Structure formats: C-alpha cells, structure tokens
Amino acid sequence: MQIFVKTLTGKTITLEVEPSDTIENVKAKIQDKEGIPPDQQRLIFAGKQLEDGRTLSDYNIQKESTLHLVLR
C-alpha cells in the first residue's frame, strides 16, 4: 500500500506500508524521511486522530490515502 503523509509545511512524504503496519511504524518511517521525532508527530486521517498502537487497516487507510501531520 502506498500512502502519502503531508508535513506541516505541506511537503509530501510517500511511504510504502502494509495494512497491518501500526501508526508507530509509520512515525518511524517519517522520522527516517524527514528527521521529525516520533514524539513530536501527531497524525490525522479523514479527521481521525491516529493512535500509535493501532494499524492502518484499523482506520480504513487504503492505497493513495493521505495522512497529515498536525499540531496539538
């Protein structure tokens, strides 16, 4: 599954993931791409705040879905 993560500046990160990847796994991948620490990352998909220990398929994230890094 290819997904897109937009940073707070709107830069697109493209990631290759599996349905069972956790959000914590996705935060690690974002750290590798952009140097953003996982504990500073907050992700949203379709208005939903994404929890570290749940999976992409738990949130119905699919091929070409876009997630956003946001502020609290």
Judged by the rule CB under 5 A, the positions of this chain that interact with Zn ion are 1, 18, 21
In the complex, least distance from residue 13 CB atom to Zn ion, rounded to whole angstroms = 15
In the complex, least distance from residue 21 CB atom to Zn ion, rounded to whole angstroms = 4
Toward Zn ion, which CB reaches closer, 27 or 69? 27
Altogether, the residues listed in the chain come to a count of 72
Toward Zn ion, which CB reaches closer, 15 or 36? 15
* Neighbour tally for 41: CB within 10 Å: 22
Toward Zn ion, which CB reaches closer, 8 or 64? 64
Contact 21, 61 (CB under 8 A): no
Contact 66, 7 (CB under 8 A): no
